[PDB]
Amino acid sequence: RDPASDQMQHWKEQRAAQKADVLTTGAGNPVGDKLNVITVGPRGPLLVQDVVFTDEMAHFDRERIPERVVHAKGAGAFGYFEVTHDITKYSKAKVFEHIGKKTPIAVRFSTVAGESGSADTVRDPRGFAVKFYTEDGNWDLVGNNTPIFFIRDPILFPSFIHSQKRNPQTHLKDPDMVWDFWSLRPESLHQVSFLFSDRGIPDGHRHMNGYGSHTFKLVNANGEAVYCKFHYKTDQGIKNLSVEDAARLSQEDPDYGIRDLFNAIATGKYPSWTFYIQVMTFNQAETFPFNPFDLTKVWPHKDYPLIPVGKLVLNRNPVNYFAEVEQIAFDPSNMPPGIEASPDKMLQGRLFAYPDTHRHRLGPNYLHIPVNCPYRARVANYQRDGPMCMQDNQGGAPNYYPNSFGAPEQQPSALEHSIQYSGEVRRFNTANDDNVTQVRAFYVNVLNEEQRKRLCENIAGHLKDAQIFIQKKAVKNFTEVHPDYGSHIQALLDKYNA
Amino acid sequence: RDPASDQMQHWKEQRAAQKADVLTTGAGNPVGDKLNVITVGPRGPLLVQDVVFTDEMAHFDRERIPERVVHAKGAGAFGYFEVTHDITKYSKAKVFEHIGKKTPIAVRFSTVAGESGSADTVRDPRGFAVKFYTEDGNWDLVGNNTPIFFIRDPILFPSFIHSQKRNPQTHLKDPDMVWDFWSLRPESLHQVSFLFSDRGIPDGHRHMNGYGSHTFKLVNANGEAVYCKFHYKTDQGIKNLSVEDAARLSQEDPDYGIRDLFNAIATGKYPSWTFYIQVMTFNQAETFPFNPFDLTKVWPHKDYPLIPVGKLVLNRNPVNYFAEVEQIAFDPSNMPPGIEASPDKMLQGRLFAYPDTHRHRLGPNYLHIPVNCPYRARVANYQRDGPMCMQDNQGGAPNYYPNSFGAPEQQPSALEHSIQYSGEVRRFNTANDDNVTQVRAFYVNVLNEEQRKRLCENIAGHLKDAQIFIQKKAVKNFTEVHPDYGSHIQALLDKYNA
Amino acid sequence: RDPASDQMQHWKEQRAAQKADVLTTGAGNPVGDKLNVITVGPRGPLLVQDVVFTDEMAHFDRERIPERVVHAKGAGAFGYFEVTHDITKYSKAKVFEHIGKKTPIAVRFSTVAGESGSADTVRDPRGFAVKFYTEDGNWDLVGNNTPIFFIRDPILFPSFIHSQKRNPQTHLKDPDMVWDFWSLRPESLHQVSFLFSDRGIPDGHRHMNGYGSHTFKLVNANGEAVYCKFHYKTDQGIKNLSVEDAARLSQEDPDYGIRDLFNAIATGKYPSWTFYIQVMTFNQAETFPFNPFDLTKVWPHKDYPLIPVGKLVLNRNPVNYFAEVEQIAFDPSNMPPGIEASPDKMLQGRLFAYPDTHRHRLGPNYLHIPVNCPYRARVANYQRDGPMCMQDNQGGAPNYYPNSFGAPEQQPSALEHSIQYSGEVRRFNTANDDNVTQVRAFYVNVLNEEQRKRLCENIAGHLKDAQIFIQKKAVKNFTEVHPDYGSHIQALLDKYNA
Amino acid sequence: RDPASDQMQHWKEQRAAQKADVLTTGAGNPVGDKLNVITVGPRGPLLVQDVVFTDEMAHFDRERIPERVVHAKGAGAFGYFEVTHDITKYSKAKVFEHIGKKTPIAVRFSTVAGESGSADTVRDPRGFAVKFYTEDGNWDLVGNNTPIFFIRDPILFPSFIHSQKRNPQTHLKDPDMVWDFWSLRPESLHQVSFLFSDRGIPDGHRHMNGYGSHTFKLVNANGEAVYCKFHYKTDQGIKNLSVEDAARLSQEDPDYGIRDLFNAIATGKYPSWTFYIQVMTFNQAETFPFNPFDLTKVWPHKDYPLIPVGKLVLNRNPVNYFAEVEQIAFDPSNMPPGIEASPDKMLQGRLFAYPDTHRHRLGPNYLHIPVNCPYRARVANYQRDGPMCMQDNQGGAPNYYPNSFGAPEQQPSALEHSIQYSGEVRRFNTANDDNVTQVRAFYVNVLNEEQRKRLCENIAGHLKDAQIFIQKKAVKNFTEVHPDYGSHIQALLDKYNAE
Ligand code: HEM
């Protein structure tokens, strides 16, 4: 059989010589009997003296934590990131310090809208989160399998999720909400194409690329700053599943990705990704035709060729899923020196959003969990107390800064880059920006005839369920993108409606 | 289209005349703009002054509560319970006070092992929970579609769930755990048959019966007590789905039951159940061949004919799923006067288990939620404070009992029945009780040839994935139940393994 | 006796005619007996069937919520705010709409460092929080009895609290931490004087003034904006307690303020405050000698005379302290239209800090608690779900914005004021600003000889416990403020040390 | 100065050679500057990019956990328990395995009604909780400075606390509630005397005795069982504070006990307690004049002499109060083999009450906190997951029992003692039991004239604030206890009321 199905058996093989441990309660008290409870005779009521039963039932009653609001379904793995090229001119981060340096990494793949028990082989963008354990703390690169996103303004992200999730009343998926939101927000059209192409349903997590959608900032030792885009492309090749195969796998094996990744890692076929960066100077950003910080746009390779950096490899499956995968947290705000945020609005929203939900669902001290703990760095600060504070709470050291008792001191070298920003402080509308030129390029050049036909068919099949005026608005947007695109969509919708 | 898909449209039709409300924050402050955020110019960073954005994102980050440890996937409805016959001789409860009395009820159907996003059309026992709003408080009748259960000892319930759920490491369903637990616990064999028969996959919640598996105690005005079993049988008839149809629906519509129930209630086809009780006297309990409090056994109809009581009808869909279905809590300990627990161990375990998990996942004051609040009874007690205590916290009334300031007083008439229990206080083993006679009767008499063949085929198909020795133990147990049963299972397993 | 001690008796007088209510559980089930538990005979063990006992004990176990990190000890009252003058030229807020308008208000007084059981009559700044229930939501004016504060940078606020609170190891008040922090941060000197003057220990909450320390922004209908400072001065007159009297009251009655306020309101002697505002134009802000947004500085009355607005009156004691005082939350971010924040850094920090701690200690939906609920405004938004979500969760309305189904729409008239800000984005040091001129003015002109002598004596008495070098640094700072001040402090410290 | 006030200085002396550590965020990222925030120019608004500020403020906003519903104010210490005598005939517990065995212990003293910032030198019973780290898990002996308690029925405990705590409306201490509850429940009279005697205000935690109020059950290797009462008496001697001195200390130093204990341990003057047990056989329990499981009664020394066992010593102050004292949890249900509960109702109530509140205020996995973790025992079970589950969550081991994959197995030797209990299952009233004979003995024999006079004066001073009929009922109960007692109380109350 496959290794996963033999997991317990392998465990039994590891402890074949060792004797079974003595059963205990939470406090370590041995248990005389766990197959039966205390009663007043053979057919009497239960008693409170059965402390072991109460402890077991109470802990069983509290095994569930709140699921992630998005990306609930997921798989996890661990490995290393290896540097193969020198980019010290662009950044001063310790991860890129020198060639050959190896940094431990924790990786989690996920699906956006699927809940905890949702199937994996469905049409949905795939989230790809990486956590590097560097000497200067944790670095969280939380991207997707797509270099762009539906929207460019953070405040609309919740509503978008509410559109992609179940109806508040019927608790059913409502295509009307999805297509109404997309039609009212044509900026998503680009991503929509990427969603309904062949890449929408990858054949496992090992056969899909990963992109850092946002543009970040890289600062070198001399203080020079350049904007950057992160990419990581799979070395196993791109492979996609047909719609029929995806439905068959969903009915048969909803956990196709988890099983595939686990068996691949166990058998030694370690997946790998090659890491690239695109670099943009401030002058290029000023002269860029579009807004370089727009999450809906991409940097063309011809103007901004990929620059290799290193390689990602995964070589360890989780020992316990809940401890190492369910409780793992990726905060994009964890950026070490040499890497800083950009004026991209979506990134700014994520910076606040992620730690807040992590504190809510995992706890205020979630960072001290072993999977999220920067075990390669020394954490010394003036944060004290907190629920479930493990360790020694930094002992009896002074808890106020500044102080005259040799407490931790700030490091001036880790300051942030300073930039002059013009314009008045207010709300600027970005819905009228260009939303069709790159989509037109993708439709015309990147895709061949067969891919275009499949794209149109899939979009029509999903959109037939929506109401008429929503279909008309979506077709209008597609026609603005390209006439033949909208005409094909309209013909397919007419066929479905008839 | 179906009503559910038109839900929002119907909402728009209700407020066609009414003007749209003004958008506000949580505190009621009007929002100038929600499509954009505050930045330092067109391409500047985000500011903390955007309080509306922080509020929206913080609330979005906290939309998820812990799912139910079991019965996570579910559907909800509301209606009334109507009395059609007089059983005042058996019980004094206000619900059975007189003929024609109507009591509001809230009903929730669920599947045991399926998580939040799990499909409905799968082979799994169906949970059926009812909450009656009586003048003497809430009555929670929390049964299943089966009158029995796999085990008879509460302390084994968590492990059983751990066997029916994902592997701790791979996060995959492991048939090895399930069949190892069942083989080591042959008492489940009875339920296993009920699980693998045609009833294992009902065609929606409206075409399955509901049973109160435990035996309870009914006390009349004169203090006489009799044990009872609750039943509620569907008036729409029993209908089951084939395995192929179930898989097709799971791949197509994981929410088949929710959609079916919602559309049926919306269109006016209100489902109905007829309510019955079996009655046992204490002398009959003493002379019963088996233990009458064993959850694995049933009371034969011939010796204990069904006695009609009333009828259940559902005629209202939830307005909001999360408020009325996700946050609803059924505590079996909520038993009004005239209904009391039995010495059945499993019921005693549930009595403590349910309120504990409810306090954990919903909050200490979960009972004050409108769906769970006994709005037909006046709650006056000496419980004070608590997180998120709504209402007035009973004002400035005295908070200590006894007192000399006209505070609430106990009602002696609501005392419990007193019974003399013999035997010493210790742990009594119940694994050696009879586990094959009723299973043999069910296999031989109740089931016809086709049902027996389908049962054997389904059991073999599920059990082929397990290891060899587990198969041998399960086949041994089936042979103990009946020779032909085990022989057919063994032949099918040999075919699958070959 | 005083009314408070007769509270229960008065309750008994209100329900003299009414019969005592029937005791019930949380679910409304009547309780047969609450004075005794269920046991196996007179001297047997306890049973799980005693559901009432488990419910009562479980709720008793969960009566405590996390106390406020600061301002834990407090008193509460309710009343109205009445407008007496027209300031529509400065602001467009509904509270100042027209003369004679009355707005419900909830008021809470507190002491900063005192914990829940801490005494009230101690030397500590007094927090004064007001919550106006306006048609445009809640307005939270959260000031103190002092118009300034120790620090001007938000990031130092936690450490300051850690200095004013117990040692991490010994759990004792450490004057070394307090005076080390103050000496290292001479900007606090101003506030320190205000702390050690006669006002440091007010004779109850009714004999102290209240100030809105931060400068806010007022916007009129025409879009013109002006900075403002809020004041509310007591009509009962300023009255202070001697140190000996304060210690005597602390040993006798730690709840002196609560009792005083409760009895005053019950007897009809309603306390009152007169509301004033200072107004600054943008030109004046540019030409102001200091930074007008510095929390350590004040606006002189001669240059910026007080302008009366209205009056505050309290006329209702809490019915339940925990529901109406412990669970009340004041978020400064709740600012209706016409009132906006300033570039003061401390205010910006508070804007994020307060709702976060409120969500932590009260819950994500704390705003829906009746005391904090804007019952005079209609809350319509796209926030859904959440733990312990009461009401109907906005029903089945659309949960995504924008939408085409008549959902709530934004109000453009409630937009924020736009201002051009110059300078580069970085961290600017503010520790070198002026810290002695206003302190010198306060020491020389405002205070008479007796007040100066008492100030020096109190400061020396508190500072004698600190180490020598801390005393030298503090004396150096005082000498920088004024020579005689430091000389008197040094002489007193020499006397104490000798 | 005293060591406590020099604490930080001593810390500075320990790291005099070591260089200051680099300041970091929660994730370990170095902080460029912590004295200032990011703004749009010198006088601009705050930005979200200041992640360090948001992290610090968010953690500061979440430094407070729910305080204990009772015994909020407290002090903590650590040390060892040493066996000096052999009682293996009575119990088989590993702590009493052999003479000279030393077991780590964590001790917490507390005051019942005082909140977190409440003063220590007040008239209130003192809670004394001990946690032994034995090879067979944790043993929690959670007693008080008194061998008895006000009530004997668990269901009345919350109301009693509600009487001893602030009014729901005024948030003030109400003597009316306290004395109404005590008068309606005369069974508390015994404890009331113990509360209003000189022992009501001990001169620190080092000068008071500690008692295990409940009667427990001790089982030996051969299965024989005997009931027991635990005692631990201070070796420093009993010392009490006068009312005037107590008020003076409360106004001056509310943390008198904490400071005293910390300085005593730091200076080397380690406090000590001698451990004793009273033993009762089942026949003696049957023939006992009262109910031996009544928490309101005591076992006379003459009939049941004290039997020494060992000694308790404290020799380590907490490194961090919050981690080691605020988050410490004592569950009486943590009883290793050889020690079992009795049919005492109050103990049965505590067994369920304590872990529930601990799960509420500390978290479902509070037992894995280092102070509460049985680091001297191996915890292997089928409990999985849970919020903030540290360690490895027992790895990928099987999570269902029984199983055929070499998972942890039960130990039959750790079974509980079996006893036949007679009588029908119902609610039995215990309010009519004897409530005056032992109180009369305590008033007449144990106390001298001066102690009796001070007791009467203190009771009258507290009770004068109550309403008239409450005073009459309390005086009636005292007269039932003894005539002169009630007469003195009535005369003092008349004097106070006439004022
Ligand atoms: C303003 C825009 C966004 C917001 C507010 C947001 C919010 C969130 C939240 C609240 C979570 C829950 C994480 C947890 O509970 O552990 C999450 C997870 C995640 N998000 Fe986003 N999201 C946004 C856009 C994006 C973008 C643009 C990407 C990638 C290009 C992305 C990729 C992910 C991934 C991969 C996860 C998985 C986290 C994990 O596995 O622990 N999201 N996001």
Phi, psi of D54 (to 5 degrees): -65, -40
In angstroms, rounded to a whole number, what is the distance separating the alpha carbons of residues C311 and C292? 26
**Helix, coil or strand: residue D110:** strand
In angstroms, rounded to a whole number, what is the distance separating the alpha carbons of residues D480 and D466? 20
Phi, psi of D94 (to 5 degrees): -65, -25
Radius of gyration of chain A (CA): 26
Are A341 and A351 contacting, i.e. CB atoms less than 8 angstroms apart? yes
Of C134, C178, C147, C143, residue with least CA distance to C160: C178
Distance from residue A354's CA to the centre of ligand 1 (Å): 7
Q: Report the run of H or E that residue D491 belongs to, with start and end.
A: helix D483-498
Question: What is the nearest CA distance from D47 to chain C, expressed in angstroms?
Answer: 9
Chain C: residue nearest B361 by CA?
C387
Task: Give the resolution value in Å.
Answer: 2.6
The answer to the question of residue B420 being in a domain is no
The answer to the question of residue D53 being in a domain is yes
* Method by which the model was determined: cryo-EM
Task: Show which of C354, C373, C392 is a domain's final residue.
Answer: C373
State the number of CA atoms in the 13 A half-sphere of B389 facing the CB: 24
Q: Which segments of B234-340 does DSSP mark as H helices, in order?
A: 243-252, 256-266, 282-287, 321
Q: What contacts B494, CB < 8 A, 6 or more positions away? A: none
Q: Looking up tokens 């809590």, which residue turns up?
A: B329
Of B87, B83, B85, B78, residue with least CA distance to B339: B87
Q: Quick one: tokens of A265?
A: 């890692």
Active site residue C71: yes
Phi-psi region of C388 (alpha: psi -120 to 50; beta: other; left: phi over 0): left
C23 and B365: CB-CB below 8 Å? no
Are C493 and C451 contacting, i.e. CB atoms less than 8 angstroms apart? no
Of C229, C236, C314, residue with least CA distance to C276: C229
Are A140 and A330 contacting, i.e. CB atoms less than 8 angstroms apart? yes
Strands A225-234 and A210-219: antiparallel
- Are residues A28 and A12 part of one domain? yes
Q: Which segments of D40-197 does DSSP mark as H helices, in order?
A: 51-60, 157-164, 175-184, 189-196
Which atom of ligand 1 lies at the shortest distance from residue A349's CA?
A: 1
D320 and C169: CB-CB below 8 Å? yes
Q: Is A443 annotated as a binding residue?
A: no
**Helix, coil or strand: residue B219:** strand
Q: Report the run of H or E that residue B279 belongs to, with start and end.
A: strand B272-280
Are A117 and B165 contacting, i.e. CB atoms less than 8 angstroms apart? no
- Are residues B176 and B234 part of one domain? no
In angstroms, rounded to a whole number, what is the distance separating the alpha carbons of residues A479 and A183? 12
Q: How many residues does chain B have?
A: 498
Cα-based distances in Å from D442 to A255, D209, D453, D455, D462: 73, 17, 14, 12, 21
Are D340 and D150 contacting, i.e. CB atoms less than 8 angstroms apart? no
The residues facing D236 across adjacent strands are none
In angstroms, rounded to a whole number, what is the distance separating the alpha carbons of residues A102 and D158? 59
- What angle is formed at CA B266 by the lines to CA B264 and CA B272, rounded to 5 degrees? 45
Q: Would you call the peptide bond into C402 cis, given omega within 30 degrees of 0 as the criterion? A: yes
Q: What contacts C364, CB < 8 A, 6 or more positions away? A: A360, B58, B59, B62, C386, C387
Phi, psi of D373 (to 5 degrees): -80, 130
- Are residues A192 and A120 part of one domain? no
- Say if B45 is an interface residue toward chain C (CB within 8 Å): yes
Q: What contacts C19, CB < 8 A, 6 or more positions away? A: none
Contacts of D403 in chain B (CB under 8 A): 177, 180-181, 184
Q: Quick one: tokens of D490?
A: 């009535």
* Burial class of residue C450 in the structure, from the number of CB atoms within 10 Å of its CB (0-12 exposed, 13-18 middle, 19+ buried): exposed
The answer to the question of residue D290 being in a domain is yes
- What angle is formed at CA B456 by the lines to CA B453 and CA B459, rounded to 5 degrees? 145
Are B349 and C423 contacting, i.e. CB atoms less than 8 angstroms apart? no
Q: What contacts D245, CB < 8 A, 6 or more positions away? A: D121
Are A383 and D56 contacting, i.e. CB atoms less than 8 angstroms apart? yes
Q: What contacts B66, CB < 8 A, 6 or more positions away? A: A64, A65, A66, B360, B361
Which of A:418-437 have CB within 8 Å of C? 418-421, 423-427
Phi, psi of C215 (to 5 degrees): -95, 130
Cα-based distances in Å from C225 to A226, B385, C484: 39, 44, 43
Q: What contacts A89, CB < 8 A, 6 or more positions away? A: A220
In angstroms, rounded to a whole number, what is the distance separating the alpha carbons of residues A148 and A295? 5
- Are residues C44 and C7 part of one domain? yes
Nearest beta carbon to residue B56 from set A158, A169, A177: A158
Q: Would you call the peptide bond into D402 cis, given omega within 30 degrees of 0 as the criterion? A: yes
Which of the listed residues A142, A148, A334 should we mutate to test ligand 1's pocket, taking the one with most ligand atoms within 8 A of CB? A142
DSSP result, C192-226:
HHHHHSGGGSBSSGGGS-EEEEEEEEEE-TTS-EE
Contacts of C384 in chain A (CB under 8 A): 162, 168
CATH number of the domain that residue B175 is part of = 1.20.1370.60
* Burial class of residue B98 in the structure, from the number of CB atoms within 10 Å of its CB (0-12 exposed, 13-18 middle, 19+ buried): exposed
State the number of CA atoms in the 13 A half-sphere of C464 facing the CB: 13
* B391 CB neighbour count, 10 Å cutoff: 13
- Are residues B336 and B316 part of one domain? yes
Core vs surface per residue D193-230: b (16+ CB within 10 A) or e: bbbbbbbbbbbbbbbbbbbbbbbbbbbbeeeebbbbbb
Task: Show which of C356, C373, C390 is a domain's final residue.
Answer: C373
Q: Report the run of H or E that residue C111 belongs to, with start and end.
A: strand C102-111
Binding-site residue set of B: 190, 197, 199, 209, 233, 299, 301-302, 354
Which of the listed residues A65, A69, A71 should we mutate to test ligand 1's pocket, taking the one with most ligand atoms within 8 A of CB? A71
Are D282 and D233 contacting, i.e. CB atoms less than 8 angstroms apart? no
Query: 3-state SS string over chain A?
Result: CCCHHHHHHHHHHHCCCCCCCECECCCCCECCCCCCCEEECCCCCEECCCHHHHHHHHHHCCCCCCCCCCCCEEEEEEEEEEECCCCCCCCCCHHHCCCCCEEEEEEEEEECCCCCCCCCCCCCCEEEEEEEEECCEEEEEEEECCCCCCCCCHHHHHHHHHHHCECCCCCCECHHHHHHHHHHCHHHHHHHHHHHCHHHCECCHHHCCEEEEEEEEEECCCCCEEEEEEEEEECCCCCECCHHHHHHHHHHCCCHHHHHHHHHHHCCCCCEEEEEEEEECHHHHHHCCCCCCCCCCCCCCCCCCCEEEEEEEEEECCCCHHHHHHCCCCCCCCCCCCEECCCCHHHHHHHHHHHHHHHHHCCCCHHHCCCCCCCCCCCCCCCCCCCCCCCCCCCCCCCCCCCCCCCCECCHHHCCCCECCCCCEEECCCCCCCCCHHHHHHHHHHCCHHHHHHHHHHHHHHHCCCCHHHHHHHHHHHHHHCHHHHHHHHHHHHHHHC
Phi-psi region of C268 (alpha: psi -120 to 50; beta: other; left: phi over 0): left
Q: Would you call the peptide bond into D364 cis, given omega within 30 degrees of 0 as the criterion? A: no
In angstroms, rounded to a whole number, what is the distance separating the alpha carbons of residues A240 and C273? 72
Contacts of D63 in chain C (CB under 8 A): 69
* Burial class of residue C469 in the structure, from the number of CB atoms within 10 Å of its CB (0-12 exposed, 13-18 middle, 19+ buried): exposed
Of C290, C293, C298, residue with least CA distance to C209: C298
Cα A371–chain centre separation: 16
List of chains touching C (3+ CB pairs within 8 A): A, B, D
In angstroms, rounded to a whole number, what is the distance separating the alpha carbons of residues B343 and C178? 63
The residues facing D202 across adjacent strands are D240
* D248 CB neighbour count, 10 Å cutoff: 15
The answer to the question of residue B415 being in a domain is no
- Are residues D182 and D70 part of one domain? no
The answer to the question of residue B336 being in a domain is yes
Q: What contacts C263, CB < 8 A, 6 or more positions away? A: C2, C3, C4
Q: Is C162 annotated as a binding residue?
A: no
CATH number of the domain that residue B32 is part of = 4.10.91.20
* D109 CB neighbour count, 10 Å cutoff: 26
Instruction: Give the DSSP letter of residue B25.
Output: -
CATH number of the domain that residue B318 is part of = 2.40.180.10
Radius of gyration of chain B (CA): 26
In angstroms, rounded to a whole number, what is the distance separating the alpha carbons of residues A204 and A261? 8
Cα-based distances in Å from D327 to A135, A167, D243, D317, D321: 31, 43, 32, 15, 9
In angstroms, rounded to a whole number, what is the distance separating the alpha carbons of residues C139 and C312? 14
In angstroms, rounded to a whole number, what is the distance separating the alpha carbons of residues B376 and B131? 13
The answer to the question of residue D412 being in a domain is no
Radius of gyration of chain C (CA): 26
Q: Looking up tokens 């004239």, which residue turns up?
A: D449
* C434 CB neighbour count, 10 Å cutoff: 14
In angstroms, rounded to a whole number, what is the distance separating the alpha carbons of residues B385 and B368? 13
- Say if B439 is an interface residue toward chain D (CB within 8 Å): no
In angstroms, rounded to a whole number, what is the distance separating the alpha carbons of residues D126 and D110? 6
The answer to the question of residue B399 being in a domain is no
Q: Quick one: tokens of C394?
A: 């906005």
- Are residues B108 and B75 part of one domain? yes
Instruction: Give the DSSP letter of residue B454.
Output: H
What ranges make up the beta strands (E) of D202-306? 210-219, 225-234, 272-280
Q: Looking up tokens 């939309």, which residue turns up?
A: B63
**Helix, coil or strand: residue D313:** strand
The dihedral sign for the CA sequence C409, C414, C420, C425? negative
In angstroms, rounded to a whole number, what is the distance separating the alpha carbons of residues A52 and A30? 9
Of A220, A252, A294, residue with least CA distance to A119: A252
Are C205 and C125 contacting, i.e. CB atoms less than 8 angstroms apart? no
Range of the domain at C451: 149-199+435-498
- Are residues C445 and C331 part of one domain? no
- Say if B34 is an interface residue toward chain A (CB within 8 Å): yes
Question: What is the nearest CA distance from A155 to chain D, expressed in angstroms?
Answer: 14
Which of the listed residues A68, A187, A295 should we mutate to test ligand 1's pocket, taking the one with most ligand atoms within 8 A of CB? A68
Are B98 and B310 contacting, i.e. CB atoms less than 8 angstroms apart? no
Q: Quick one: tokens of B288?
A: 């019963």
Are B481 and B436 contacting, i.e. CB atoms less than 8 angstroms apart? yes
Are B362 and B369 contacting, i.e. CB atoms less than 8 angstroms apart? yes
The residues facing C251 across adjacent strands are none
Of C307, C89, C338, residue with least CA distance to C219: C338
| Number of domain units in chain A | 3
Phi, psi of B84 (to 5 degrees): -120, -15
Q: Quick one: tokens of D97?
A: 């395995």
Q: Quick one: tokens of A470?
A: 């929503």
**Helix, coil or strand: residue C8:** helix
Q: What contacts B70, CB < 8 A, 6 or more positions away? A: B112, B113, B127, B161
- Are residues C131 and C235 part of one domain? yes
**Helix, coil or strand: residue B82:** strand
Which atom of ligand 1 lies at the shortest distance from residue A330's CA?
A: 41
Q: Quick one: tokens of C448?
A: 């008479």
A21 and D408: CB-CB below 8 Å? yes
What ranges make up the beta strands (E) of B317-455? 339-340, 425-427
- Are residues B317 and B226 part of one domain? yes
Cα C31–chain centre separation: 42
Radius of gyration of chain D (CA): 26
Query: Which residue type is seen at C483?
Result: P
Phi, psi of B380 (to 5 degrees): -130, 120
In angstroms, rounded to a whole number, what is the distance separating the alpha carbons of residues D298 and D285? 13
Task: Show which of C18, C35, C64 is a domain's final residue.
Answer: C64
Strands D425-427 and A272-280: unpaired
Distance from residue C319's CA to the centre of ligand 1 (Å): 45
**Helix, coil or strand: residue B471:** helix
Active site residue A162: no
Instruction: Give the DSSP letter of residue D49.
Output: T
The answer to the question of residue B353 being in a domain is yes
D11 and A396: CB-CB below 8 Å? yes
Q: Quick one: tokens of A313?
A: 């490899």
Strands C307-316 and B137-144: unpaired
- Are residues B264 and B220 part of one domain? yes
- Are residues B482 and B369 part of one domain? no
- For chain B, the maximum distance between any two Cα atoms, rounded to a whole number of angstroms, is 86
Q: Is the CB of A70 under 6 A from ligand 1?
A: yes
In angstroms, rounded to a whole number, what is the distance separating the alpha carbons of residues A340 and A333? 9
D420 and B424: CB-CB below 8 Å? yes
* D27 CB neighbour count, 10 Å cutoff: 26
Q: Is the CB of A110 under 6 A from ligand 1?
A: yes
In angstroms, rounded to a whole number, what is the distance separating the alpha carbons of residues C221 and D390? 57
The residues facing C228 across adjacent strands are C216, C279
Cα C435–chain centre separation: 25
Q: Report the run of H or E that residue B310 belongs to, with start and end.
A: strand B307-316
D7 and C169: CB-CB below 8 Å? yes
Q: Quick one: tokens of C312?
A: 């505050």
